[PDB]
From a paper:
[name] (3-oxoacyl-[name] or β-ketoacyl-[name] reductase) converts β-ketoacyl-[name] to β-hydroxyacyl-[name] in the presence of NADH or NADPH. We provide high quality crystal structures for three enzymes: a functional low molecular weight [name], a putative [name] protein, AbSDR, and a HMwFabG.
For [name], the presence of a basic residue in the Gly motif (TGASRGIG18) suggested preference for NADPH and categorization into the cP1 subfamily. To observe binding mechanisms, we performed co-crystallization with NADPH. Crystals diffracted on the MX1 beamline at the Australian Synchrotron to a resolution of 1.85 Å in the spacegroup P 43 21 2 and the final model displayed good stereochemistry and an overall Rwork and Rfree of 0.16 and 0.19 respectively. The crystallographic asymmetric unit revealed two protomers, and strong positive density allowing NADPH to be modelled within each protomer. The NADPH is bound through an extensive binding pocket, whereby the nicotinamide moiety is bonded with Lys155 and Tyr151, and the adenine ribose is bonded through Ser14, Arg15, Thr37, Asp59, Val60, and Asn86. Interestingly, contrary to previous reports of large conformation changes in [name] upon coenzyme binding (such as that in E. coli), our structure reveals little change at the active site between apo and holo proteins (chain A comparison reveals r.m.s.d = 0.107 Å).
Numbering used by the authors:
A (entry chain A), C (entry chain A): 1 to 244
B (entry chain B), D (entry chain B): 5 to 187, 193 to 244
Write the structure that this text describes.
């Protein structure tokens, strides 16, 4: 077999925003490698992507796994020319109850992972004189939320990292951007009550929660030639929940 | 087709926006300051658009133009405020006329045209207002206090209006171009040296950003500034 | 008589924030000219300031009055070396009901006035190689409020103007800054209900409305030598209502 | 007197902050990475402060130092997180150690020390946490991705904590210095050319900003970044 499409890597593609991003990038014409934290989840991704992608197990907290996954992609499918850092979790707590592990795990899964994966894909993107690094941030990197000091610090750090890397890599036509979702309908919000979803949508100028596909549409735009002169920015997709 | 109105569509950014929105499937009314320019617009757009003369400083012309569009083509459901000029000067040499003309052509025009299209957009429960701003509304440039004030005002206006109209599914956004190629060689290099991507942009880059915002792919984006400056300024 | 103190001009000093600013600048050692829209209001200012200031009538919508007032100050008290643009009103309306006059009056009173007064005091500040221009903005130049498109546009324009002028005048050691108040207790908020003031304070991290003196303290800081390396900024004084 | 804790008070910005807070009426505990540096701090502060050795990378030392202050001087009611270093490199040459050390010394230290002082500030219904950031958290600089990420993270941390602690009248703010004179002549001119005020700043400018934020004159300011950069970067 042959693999002639440009390769996109989407971390945490099992569901919701990550799944929508991965499927959209497939529709756009990429060969998409998506990751999950378990081999079973990776196999589910393989099944969903069919012959235009692949699922791989990855814990983004571990440098050896990051390096092994990117090496596998390079050896089997091609250079990673679109990297979407989407994998994440939250470990919320007011600071007085935020443990060392609460802090470290979130910083490692979000910010350190962005540093490690971006560094690891630079050589191939430089070689191609083409690259897209698209980091999933959050509205709370801008509009502070009590109980999420770790998550907010990590996402804001990601945005500043992205500015630095955009400056370092711009001459090679590699763009580095962040997408900041607002209130997006996921399993989590599905689990909330109707009244609380209404409280949330009342804060949104467009008067509704967003959908994973809205984030996918933003990522797809940034990954395309239609955004070749956009780098070092935050693309806010929050329905007017936060305006800058 | 849905009707888009693009002011100052004669050349450069405006012309690229108008042509892209035609490609996207809109019927595009583009405007120029003269009947001759309007006719050239009509000729380029063919059966997918129309050219009209409009000085955006004049409220009567704004109302006549929008009424004409409503009577002949349909409600204005995409409004792109692109028309503009500069009258640069250090503040000590910036006259009342230099200030007022820039504020009127940019900010007042945005107020007047947005107000005039609200009714049709409200009826349709669909709308795109896309205002052309500038990097200098963020990264200040000596000699452009009037232009900078007007564009920043446009961005704040857009946030307020986005809040007012969001429930009706009308989005209001700004696109802020950086250094875009218009026409000065060693100086060009100075400009490109400030850009992370190490080159000047093209009108089509701005057209692509506007096309994105005007489409269903941006239906959950409102009240934002989309910077298209190659890393010249990073927010 | 003699007038040896540096001269500060505070527009709209009759009450609230402007009155607190004017009195604080007097306490700091300035000779303070404050303005009101009527001769009676100007006389009240003269009475409050005593022999360390003066009250003058000024409608900031009129260039001839601006030029006459600054000329009077220069001829009677000294060059305006601290300018605080505080005068203002609101004319709120959703855009569909916002008239041409609603728009124009607000833009003229806020933004055009800042342009005119700043331009008029530049020569004296340049001559002194010292200057402070301090523009009163608003949190709504950042956090959008429906019904205030004119006021928001004007204050945001003022902030951008201030950046431009800061760049133009920095070599002469003239600083140009804005102070953005949040919810400050004034006659207007006094006229609101207790329940609505509680609704407001609930949005504020510090859980209370501010006081005019908080704004005065910010202006006093920026006008002093303790802020000689601060220019082109917005100093937010809103108790955490809006964080940037 | 109320007790202020200033990390990295040996020289420059930290030393200026510590001396200014002494002048303001605080009892200042300043820290250094060695017992000798701590002794020099003790000597300079005299009867208005004390010097202690502290590596902010080590949680045990943080807890021992704050406990010692509580047992000997009083609750820490002003915390200034100033200690830091740089380990610059383009990302392709930035090692895991270069990244981790900077993140730990800046951001992790801010998390740990802020957490450790919350109880005393909550009891007093008074507190000032003032974190030293940098212009490069806003205006990116090649080679400083780690430093930039850490300082931006500190600013977002500060906003979150300001929301958590505001009801108790504890403010949490950042001060972002620009180009501040430390120690390279024609290059100095390049730096000053980027500054609207056309000169490098001094440590005392940063001390003045911190002194303002730590005082009653800033009791309604929380969750902000106070830029002190002479117009190098305008927000
Ligand atoms: N959800 C929302 O409403 C919002 C989300 N965001 C951000 O967008 C992204 C999407 O969030 P969400 O849609 O909630 O994604 P989900 O929480 O729905 O699923 C998260 C994904 O991350 C993966 N993941 C979790 N921990 C690790 C790890 N240690 N190593 C590798 N992969 C891991 C999971 O793998 P597995 O499937 O095996 O668990 C899963 O694929 C996140 O970065 C989040 O911060 C921002 C704003 C709003
Ligand atoms: N060009 C650039 O590099 C950058 C431009 N921008 C902004 O992008 C937009 C496009 O810039 P640019 O392409 O230079 O366009 P201009 O600002 O030069 O605008 C020219 C167009 O506007 C029309 N126009 C001028 N005055 C009026 C008026 N009073 N009423 C109606 N139409 C008027 C002209 O009509 P006619 O053809 O008849 O003269 C022409 O179609 C502007 O808002 C500009 O400020 C932002 C940053 C960079
Ligand atoms: N009040 C608040 O809570 C907030 C206020 N601000 C801003 O801070 C400033 C203070 O607002 P506020 O405290 O309400 O001041 P007030 O509304 O209490 O009084 C306003 C002052 O402005 C003067 N004024 C009004 N129109 C004119 C005019 N055309 N020419 C000259 N002077 C005029 C009045 O003069 P006279 O006394 O003769 O009427 C009065 O002195 C304003 O710029 C406002 O936008 C921002 C955020 C919150
Ligand atoms: N200096 C400048 O131009 C600018 C600096 N900044 C920031 O302002 C702050 C001050 O900068 P600068 O004056 O250069 O200070 P540094 O970043 O050089 O910090 C030096 C001080 O921190 C101490 N320190 C270093 N490592 C540790 C550690 N692991 N644990 C505890 N203390 C430590 C040093 O102790 P010892 O004396 O024992 O070595 C010394 O007191 C920093 O956060 C800096 O990043 C921001 C922008 C501009």
């Amino acid at each position: 077999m042959t693999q002639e499409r440009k390769v996109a890597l989407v971390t945490g593609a099992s569901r919701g925003i990550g799944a929508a991003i991965a499927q959209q990038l497939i529709q756009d014409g990429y060969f998409v490698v998506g990751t999950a934290t378990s081999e079973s989840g990776a196999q589910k991704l393989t099944d969903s992507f069919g012959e235009q992608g692949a699922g791989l197990a990855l814990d983004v907290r571990n440098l050896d796994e990051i390096e092994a996954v990117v090496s596998h992609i390079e050896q089997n499918y091609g250079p990673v020319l679109v990297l979407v850092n989407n994998a994440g979790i939250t470990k919320d707590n007011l600071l007085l109850r935020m443990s060392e592990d609460d802090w470290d795990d979130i910083l490692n899964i979000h910010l350190k992972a962005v540093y490690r994966l971006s560094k690891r894909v630079l050589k191939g993107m430089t070689k191609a004189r083409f690259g897209r690094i698209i980091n999933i941030s959050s509205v709370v990197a801008h509009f502070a939320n009590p109980g999420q000091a770790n998550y907010s610090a990590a996402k804001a750090g990601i945005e500043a990292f992205s500015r630095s890397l955009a400056k370092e890599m711009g001459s090679r036509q590699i763009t580095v951007n962040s997408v900041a979702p607002g209130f997006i309908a996921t399993e989590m919000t599905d689990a909330l009550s109707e009244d609380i979803r209404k409280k949330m949508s009342d804060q949104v100028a467009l008067n509704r929660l967003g959908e994973p596909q809205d984030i996918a549409n933003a990522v797809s735009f940034l990954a395309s030639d239609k955004a070749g002169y956009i780098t070092g920015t935050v693309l806010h997709v929050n329905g007017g929940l936060y305006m800058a």
